[PDB]
Design a protein around this ligand. Structure first.
Ligand SMILES: *[C@@H]1O[C@H](CO)[C@@H](O[C@@H]2O[C@H](CO)[C@@H](O[C@@H]3O[C@H](CO)[C@@H](O)[C@H](O[C@@H]4O[C@H](CO)[C@@H](O)[C@H](O)[C@@H]4O)[C@@H]3O)[C@H](O)[C@H]2NC(C)=O)[C@H](O)[C@H]1NC(C)=O
Ligand SMILES: CCCCCC(=O)OC[C@H](COP(=O)(O)OC[C@H](N)C(=O)O)OC(=O)CCCCC
Ligand SMILES: *[C@@H]1O[C@H](CO)[C@@H](O[C@@H]2O[C@H](CO)[C@@H](O)[C@H](O)[C@H]2NC(C)=O)[C@H](O)[C@H]1NC(C)=O
Ligand SMILES: *[C@@H]1O[C@H](CO)[C@@H](O)[C@H](O)[C@H]1NC(C)=O
Ligand SMILES: [Mg+2]
Lengths: 337, 1112
């Protein structure tokens, strides 16, 4: 009437397995690990050394480049990895226009046919996208397009949301600090070399092109952010108002980074392959590096299976398979002694 | 004083007395909120997170959202309140089976005894208690069925005394014997206040224009049991919680276990890691934001003052690092403690089949205290003994006779003194031979077994005869006598008759005079005129009183009897020497005149009848001696030997007399042969301080070996224990009690059984257990660290108020050595893991402050981090502490010295807590440095050039820290059942299914809006699935090598006479070598004088029940 049942679960005698730790038990475990991690580990190294890239640090182009001819870039600003050997170092010159705005023109040689897709990034160092004041500083409803009034704005976009009894429309530290350098959408071939057109469409994420919708503000109650006031000197009108649904360079910047050294995508070309030739990229210099104190670069990678030329994952598979092939032998060392 | 009217219930409730219920429960409906909150806030993790959740409410401070830690705190405070309520309900319905027990209650409108419950007993309510029924309230008897309205009560729950006490109703009230005349009682009863003084009472009843001076001879208490009488008609006075034995019994107190006191030190040891890492991260925020103020102009930093946003960022790192302290640690260990109490109460080896009673754990907060017990404070009567006495053997004419012979102790060649054993059929063959000369001296021995008593015989409806004895010693002499023939059948007011078995003759002996047993006399005697006409005196008593009254001219069996007593007392039996003398006709009439003038003297007759009794008991002839065995419970001597091998020191605190506890201690092998008794029997407070100092001047003058300390035993009376607990003398007592093997305390009050446990508790760090039964040791159970009660044997009150209620004493072996040492070793590993599990995850927030300019940005999502403590890593702390037997149950019972691993606290310290927190730092620095070299610029994906953002990397940090901490629990655990397969690799499969469903439903409800594109760019990416299977193997490669190295190598276990001639010269030291152990359970308040004169057995029952008139 009160007797507990004699099941093996109530009497603490469940069927159980105890780990046998012995040099005949854990030895085929350590061999199965170090025979399946080494085809993976060298497969992530052979994929990372097939990525071809070129990184030109154009940070001091407004200071260390003459405006007359094509001098060479100092080699401290150049990193590059290709299959074939390069023959000419990349060149660079400054160019002012009738308005007085500078431009940095980088000429470079690509020594072999790159038959993968070509992606143009810019690298920024010493910029804290991951600051706690910075990550949360935007309005979610304004990105969706809702005409939010003043006192129901997101209070985390606090120093930049309202200038003169108005609404800063892309409020926040993120949209105010947007990278302004305009990469030219063509790699101009110099001599006996064709052009290479580069698309700036489908650059951002696919969920970003949905949630970034055109605004339902009417361009009379909204002011640009204070660092956009060179592109919009008179302000916001119904004509010059930005459509952030198709502004896919703005969607890349708002997708913040994890670390103070990051890439951002600008241009891509999936359709064709660029051949060997002397190309030229022109960069309109609008973003000063005295704002954040780091460097800005120009990247011309291709993609691998794990991203780019990053050897860290394949090495991590070989340190682990190195320890699981070391201690598969040092089982036999301490036993005999 | 308390005024009680008789037979009007409306007038005796306007004073507002208590009812008859008792409350066992920890809290009522009123005191549930303060007692549960004080129990939870005394844990330091629940007090820290109450302060953290207020720090999240000041705006712009918290890195996560503001409802993150108050939502986790309300979950664990609700699960902790559910475990408390489903125990206090089980404490309330097991309390309900007492209040709903049967009690016949007189109803004045009905005018008959109607059946009701106990709880319907109000003060002033005349009840009726039948035979062998517990008394339901503090009751004064009015009349009874026995002659002159008497009854016998058993007080084995009031104190430990194993005899019966006569209670005699007043002559003015004993006429009310019928139910129909019970409606004429009109008056009042003036009683005293409840005072918990057991043996004193004063009251005055005015019944029908006449005063009645009441007495403690007219009052029966609640714990007592009415025995050897048909019924009584008493009215109740105190009831419920104002009774004399349940005044100081309170509700279940908060008992903070010793492991929970260690967690409170490892939380203080974790605040000093918290405050350091807040200070490292907040002085780097002041340095960097003022040195690089021209390089952080895109943050639009204010720069108000260096002390203003020091504090505003002091609280941010307080919140970001607050989950170093585990929030789900205390409610995890509460449900390991709840479910271990469930598996204790479901064991068949702790289930008593005879009463159909399993063990139950009421206070389940103390399951792990059963692995650290260092002192067991036991009770004797009912706990160690079965409260049954049986005539074991007898020694007559220098020969011994026993039921069945233990063959090593058989009839051998003597040393001049015959030792050995014979059967009882040889006693029959030596009796029926007129050629053997022992046959006259055997014949007057067996008739002394069936005449000299005060047992009253009552024939049942069958041919079975029931012997009704006050003292259980002389009740076993008649029953054990009658099994050898010469059955005592009936008793007349002036004679007894003995029915001989083999001849069928019924000889009748005239009882002339009887002499009462006395503690100063240590003997009792009776004079019988035989059917021959020749009178004869019989006598039974102690050898230290009998041997001073002998004829050395006559008997030759004396030195053969005394050697049989030493063989009996070393076995543990209770002995009694039997002597007689043949007094002729003329010597009687000059003595009876001397006896009559002593008896008819009104005053001072207590000490003059024995001074008239020793004038006839001078010249006796020693027939021989008896041996009565007080039955112990089964498995008592094997449990005491096993628990003493485990390092536990057994103490005995009993309300019984001293000569019984030495006998039971000799029988249960606490005491032994070749052992010394440090007896402390002193009458004043300065006589014991001499006795405590005279022993410690002698037994610690030289350092004692561990063999010689096993020859010491402390025996202290309850009056000397009341003086040796004065605060000036408390340390002299523990200095000799810690060098003795066993401590016995005799005749101690219910309060003194608590003040001994409260004295070892505050003078040492050892954990104490107190096992007992009945309400005389209920205060002993509230005052211990673990209180155990013996379950229902017609007198349960300790097993209600206890923390564990076991079936008998032998279940203490498996409860401590198996279920106790498992519950300490499993919980100590489940707490060191839960400290580690919140360090391997939340310390990636600290290495991130060097990579975000000391801002305090969260590396992972706000709600994903609360699910870490609640869903995905809550099962391996549970299953390690529950289903993982670290060592076999067959090995813990076989080698009891493995219990000392839990007593020293080798598993759970604060120093070994640092080997897990540093293991949490090392695992957290591999997740961080491993996932910043991968995902270097965010350029780790292959999705048409797209990059992994801040939140796609934060999911890889969260998931890698889950596989690391589940892979650690897969190496920590010892035994892999099928319930570990749902916990350790089944909470990884839980998170890998929960995450695509949580992050594809909840962002559309504006909850966790950082996950809009994370599932495509984590689960669709090849770099995420390759990170999860190489970084946990990289970080647990040291834990797989240390666990393999710990298995093969580095193993742990899971001048004799110079003192013995010096210790005897102290004042009250006795040795157990030639002690001739005498014990008789009769008392002076037992009423053995007049009950032999008042009973006619052949007279049958009256019309009003089983009532018999006084036939004197
Ligand atoms: C690309 O992005 C660059 C960095 O975000 C940006 O450079 C900044 O541009 C702003 C806008 O012109 C500059 O702000 C100026 O501040 C000076 C004072 O140092 C003022 O002359 C002026 O502020 C004025 O403030 C008045 C009230 O305070 C206001 O009513 C006036 O309208 C006026 O705004 C300028 O605003 C800033 O110094 C630039 N440098 C840095 C390091 O921040 C580039 O212009 C931008 N380029 C393009 C093409 O968009
Ligand atoms: C690299 C820094 C690691 C961080 C430091 C660290 O983890 O030290 C604590 C450990 C304690 O051992 P475990 O935590 O495996 O538990 C052991 C338990 N008795 C069991 O049975 O599992 O010490 C060693 O193993 C010493 C080897 C050190 C070798 C460097
Ligand atoms: C990718 O680059 C190739 C160049 O290698 C582009 O192909 C050229 O596109 C232009 C369009 O103005 C045509 O006039 C040329 O004839 C094309 N050349 C070849 C060899 O096909 C291609 O359009 C680019 N993809 C884009 C812009 O999406
Ligand atoms: C291709 O590049 C040329 C060079 O400037 C440009 O004129 C043309 O518009 C580009 N084609 C497209 C489709 O943009
Ligand atoms: Mg008892």
């Amino acid at each position: 009437s009160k007797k507990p049942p004699n099941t093996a679960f109530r009497q603490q005698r469940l069927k159980a397995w105890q780990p046998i730790l012995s040099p005949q038990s854990v030895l085929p475990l350590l061999i199965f690990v170090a025979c399946i991690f080494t085809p993976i580990g060298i497969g992530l190294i052979v994929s990372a050394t097939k990525v071809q890239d070129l990184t030109i640090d154009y940070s001091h182009c407004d200071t260390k480049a003459s405006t007359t001819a094509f001098e060479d870039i100092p080699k401290k600003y150049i990193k590059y990895h290709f299959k074939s050997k390069v023959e000419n170092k990349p060149q660079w010159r400054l160019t002012e226009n009738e308005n007085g705005e500078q431009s940095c023109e980088l000429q470079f040689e690509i020594p072999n046919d790159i038959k993968k897709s070509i992606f143009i990034y810019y690298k920024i160092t010493n910029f804290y996208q991951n600051h706690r004041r910075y990550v949360q500083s935007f309005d979610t409803k304004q990105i969706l397009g809702e005409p939010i009034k003043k006192d129901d704005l997101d209070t985390s976009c606090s120093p930049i949301r309202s200038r003169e009894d108005k609404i800063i429309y892309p409020c926040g530290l993120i949209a105010n600090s947007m990278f302004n350098d305009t990469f030219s959408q063509v790699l101009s071939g110099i001599d006996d070399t064709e052009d290479y057109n580069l698309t700036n469409k489908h650059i951002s994420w696919s969920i970003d092109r949905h949630r970034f919708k055109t605004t339902k503000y009417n361009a009379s109650d909204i002011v640009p952010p204070p660092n956009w006031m060179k592109k919009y000197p008179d302000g916001y009108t119904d004509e010059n108002l930005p459509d952030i649904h198709t502004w896919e360079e703005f969607q890349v910047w708002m997708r913040t980074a994890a670390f103070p050294k990051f890439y951002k995508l600008t241009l891509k070309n999936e359709s064709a392959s660029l051949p060997k030739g002397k190309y030229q990229m022109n960069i309109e210099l609008n973003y000063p590096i005295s704002l954040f104190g780091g460097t800005k670069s120009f990247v011309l990678t291709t993609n691998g299976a794990i991203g780019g030329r990053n050897m860290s994952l394949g090495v991590l598979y070989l340190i682990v398979a190195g320890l699981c092939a070391l201690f598969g032998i040092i089982f036999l060392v301490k036993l005999i002694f | 004083p308390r005024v009680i009217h008789i037979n009007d219930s409306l007038a005796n409730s306007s004073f507002g007395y208590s009812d008859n219920h008792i409350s066992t429960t920890k809290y009522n409906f009123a005191t549930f909120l303060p007692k549960f909150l004080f129990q939870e806030f005394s844990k330091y993790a629940n007090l820290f997170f109450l302060c953290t959740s207020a720090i999240q409410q000041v705006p712009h401070v918290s890195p996560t959202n503001r409802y993150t830690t108050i939502g986790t705190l309300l979950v664990v405070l609700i699960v902790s309140a559910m475990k408390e309520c489903i125990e206090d309900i089980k404490r309330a319905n097991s309390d309900k089976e007492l209040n709903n027990s049967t009690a016949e209650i007189f109803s004045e409108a009905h005018d008959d005894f109607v059946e009701k419950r106990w709880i319907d007993i109000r003060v002033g309510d005349i009840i009726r208690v039948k035979s062998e029924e517990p008394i339901p309230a503090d009751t004064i008897i009015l009349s009874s069925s026995e002659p002159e309205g008497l009854c016998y009560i058993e007080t084995a729950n009031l104190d430990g005394e194993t005899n019966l006490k006569i209670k005699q109703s007043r002559v003015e009230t004993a006429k009310f014997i019928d139910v129909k005349t019970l409606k004429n009682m009109n008056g009042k009863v003036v009683s005293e206040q409840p005072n918990s003084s057991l043996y004193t009472y004063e009251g005055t009843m005015t019944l029908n224009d006449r005063q009645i001076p009441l007495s403690p001879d007219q009052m029966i208490l609640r714990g007592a049991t009415l025995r050897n009488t048909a019924w009584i008609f008493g009215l109740v006075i105190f009831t419920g919680h104002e009774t004399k034995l349940l005044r100081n019994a309170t509700a279940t107190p908060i008992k903070r276990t010793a492991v929970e006191k260690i967690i409170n030190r490892q939380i203080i040891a974790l605040f000093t890691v918290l405050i350091v890492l807040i200070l490292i991260s907040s002085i780097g925020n002041v340095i960097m934001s003022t040195a690089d103020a021209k390089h952080l102009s895109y943050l639009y930093l204010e720069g108000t003052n260096k002390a203003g946003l020091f504090f505003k960022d002091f609280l941010t790192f307080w919140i970001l690092f607050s989950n170093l302290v585990p929030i789900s640690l205390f409610v995890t260990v509460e449900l390991i403690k709840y479910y271990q109490a469930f598996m204790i109460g479901s064991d068949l080896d702790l289930y008593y089949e005879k009463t159909d009673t399993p063990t139950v754990v009421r206070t389940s907060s103390l399951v792990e205290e059963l692995g650290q017990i260092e002192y067991i404070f036991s009770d004797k009567t009912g706990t160690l003994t079965r409260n049954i006495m049986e005539f074991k053997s007898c020694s007559i004419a220098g020969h011994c006779y026993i039921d069945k012979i233990p063959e090593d102790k058989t009839a051998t060649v003597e040393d001049g003194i015959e030792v050995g054993y014979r059967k009882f059929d040889d006693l029959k063959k030596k009796l029926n031979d007129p050629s053997d000369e022992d046959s006259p001296i055997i014949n007057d021995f067996l008739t002394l077994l069936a005449t000299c008593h005060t047992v009253i015989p009552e024939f049942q409806s069958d041919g079975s005869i029931k012997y009704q004895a006050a003292s259980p010693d002389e009740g076993a002499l008649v029953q054990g006598g009658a099994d050898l023939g010469y059955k005592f059948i009936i008793r007349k007011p002036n004679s007894v008759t003995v029915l001989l078995e083999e001849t069928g003759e019924e000889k009748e002996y005239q009882l002339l005079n009887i002499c009462e047993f006395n503690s100063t006399r240590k003997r009792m005697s009776a004079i019988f005129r035989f059917p021959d006409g020749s009178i004869k005196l019989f006598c039974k008593g102690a050898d230290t009183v009998i041997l001073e009254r002998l004829d050395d001219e006559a008997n030759q069996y004396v030195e053969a009897t005394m050697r049989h007593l030493e063989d009996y007392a070393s076995e543990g039996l209770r002995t009694l020497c039997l002597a007689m003398r043949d007094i002729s006709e003329g010597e009687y009439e000059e003595w009876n005149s001397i006896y009559n003038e002593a008896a008819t003297t009104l005053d001072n007759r207590a000490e003059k009848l024995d001074e008239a009794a020793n004038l006839i008991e001078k010249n006796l002839i020693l027939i021989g001696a008896t041996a009565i065995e007080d039955k112990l419970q089964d498995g008592v001597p094997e449990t005491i030997h096993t628990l003493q091998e485990a390092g536990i020191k057994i103490w005995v605190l009993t309300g019984d007399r001293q000569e019984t506890a030495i006998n039971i201690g000799m029988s249960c092998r606490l005491l032994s042969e070749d052992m010394n008794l440090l007896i402390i029997n002193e009458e004043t407070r300065d006589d014991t301080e001499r006795n405590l100092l005279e022993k410690i001047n002698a037994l610690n003058e030289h350092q004692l070996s561990t063999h010689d300390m096993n020859t010491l035993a402390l025996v202290i009376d309850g009056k000397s224990l009341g003086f040796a607990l004065e605060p000036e003398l408390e340390d002299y007592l523990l200095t000799v009690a810690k060098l003795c093997k066993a401590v016995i305390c005799c005749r101690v009050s219910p309060l003194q059984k608590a003040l001994v446990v409260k004295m070892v508790k505050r003078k040492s760090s050892s954990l104490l257990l107190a096992i007992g039964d009945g309400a005389n040791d209920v205060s002993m159970i509230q005052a211990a660290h673990v209180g155990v009660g013996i379950s229902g044997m017609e007198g349960m009150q300790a097993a209600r108020s206890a923390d564990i209620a076991v079936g008998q004493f032998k279940f203490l072996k498996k409860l401590l050595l198996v279920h106790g040492s498992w519950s300490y070793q499993r919980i100590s590993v489940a707490i060191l893991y839960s400290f580690y599990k919140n360090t391997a995850l939340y310390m990636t927030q600290f290495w991130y402050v060097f990579a975000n300019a000391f801002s305090g940005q969260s590396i992972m999502e706000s709600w994903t981090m609360s699910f870490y403590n609640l869903f995905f890593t809550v099962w391996p702390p549970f299953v390690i502490g529950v289903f993982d037997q670290f060592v076999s149950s067959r090995l813990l019972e076989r080698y009891p010295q493995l219990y000392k691993l839990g007593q020293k606290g080798q598993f759970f310290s604060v120093y070994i807590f640092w080997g897990w927190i540093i293991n949490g730092f090392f695992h957290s620095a591999i997740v961080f440095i491993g996932t910043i070299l991968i995902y270097r610029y965010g350029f780790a994906l292959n999705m048409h050039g797209e990059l992994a953002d801040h939140w796609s990397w934060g999911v890889t940090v969260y998931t890698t820290s889950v596989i690391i901490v589940l892979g650690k629990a897969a190496l920590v655990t010892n035994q892999w059942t099928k319930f570990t397969l749902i916990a350790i690799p089944g909470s990884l499969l839980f998170w890998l299914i929960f995450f695509p469903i949580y992050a594809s439903i909840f962002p559309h409800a504006n909850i966790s809006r950082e996950y809009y594109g994370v599932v495509k760019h984590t689960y669709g990416s090849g770099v995420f699935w390759l990170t999860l299977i190489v970084l946990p193997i990289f970080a647990l490669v040291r834990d797989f090598l240390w666990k393999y190295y710990k298995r093969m190598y580095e193993p742990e276990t899971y001048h004799v006479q110079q003192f013995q001639n010096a210790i005897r010269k102290v004042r009250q030291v006795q040795r157990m070598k030639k002690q001739r152990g005498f014990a008789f359970s009769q008392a002076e308040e037992g009423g053995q004088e007049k009950i032999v004169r008042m009973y006619d057995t052949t007279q049958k029952r009256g019309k009003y029940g089983e009532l018999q008139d006084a036939s004197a």
